Amino acid sequence: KVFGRCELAAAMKRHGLDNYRGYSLGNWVCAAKFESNFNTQATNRNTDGSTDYGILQINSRWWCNDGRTPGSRNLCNIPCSALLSSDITASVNCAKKIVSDGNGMNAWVAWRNRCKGTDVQAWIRGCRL
């Protein structure tokens, strides 16, 4: 599913991401935009052989099991395919584990390079939330 910007904001809010560990909703929307262009089916392979999955591009080296990333962990205890669902619950629940891991949203390289230190509230302006 390709979300609309406000539709995704609402979904994320309902799943407890607004201000989760102090990151306002626009941060999450901004990271999704640049990670996946709001497409839950996005996948991208990394140079190390791991793959990033879903709307928040969660990596198989640490967070999910895809059966093809040797020596990896599965810290969210989920098949990576669950991250591609139109239902974002598994991506959000896993993102909450990731953002709590020490480095905050800096875990998402696109957040650090494209969202951090920008007016992220712009991403939810105009939405009914």
Residue among 24 and 43 whose Cβ is closer to Na ion = 43
Cα distance between residue 23 and residue 66, in whole Å = 29
3-state secondary structure of 98: helix
From the CB of 74, what's the least distance to Na ion, in Å? Answer: 5
- Of 72, 78, 84, 90, which lies in the binding site for Na ion, with binding defined by CB under 5 A? 72
Q: State the nearest-atom distance from the C-beta of 10 to Na ion, in Å.
A: 30
Site size for Na ion, by CB under 5 A? Answer: 5
Helix axes 25-36, 5-14, angle to 10 degrees: 130
**Cα–Cα distance between 128 and 6 in angstroms, integer?**
7
| Active site (annotated) includes residue 35 | yes
Nearer to Na ion, 48 or 119 (CB): 48
If one counts every other C-beta atom within 10 angstroms of the C-beta of residue 15, the result is: 17
Residue positions annotated with a catalytic role: 35, 52
Residues that bind Na ion (CB under 5 A): 60, 65, 69, 72, 74
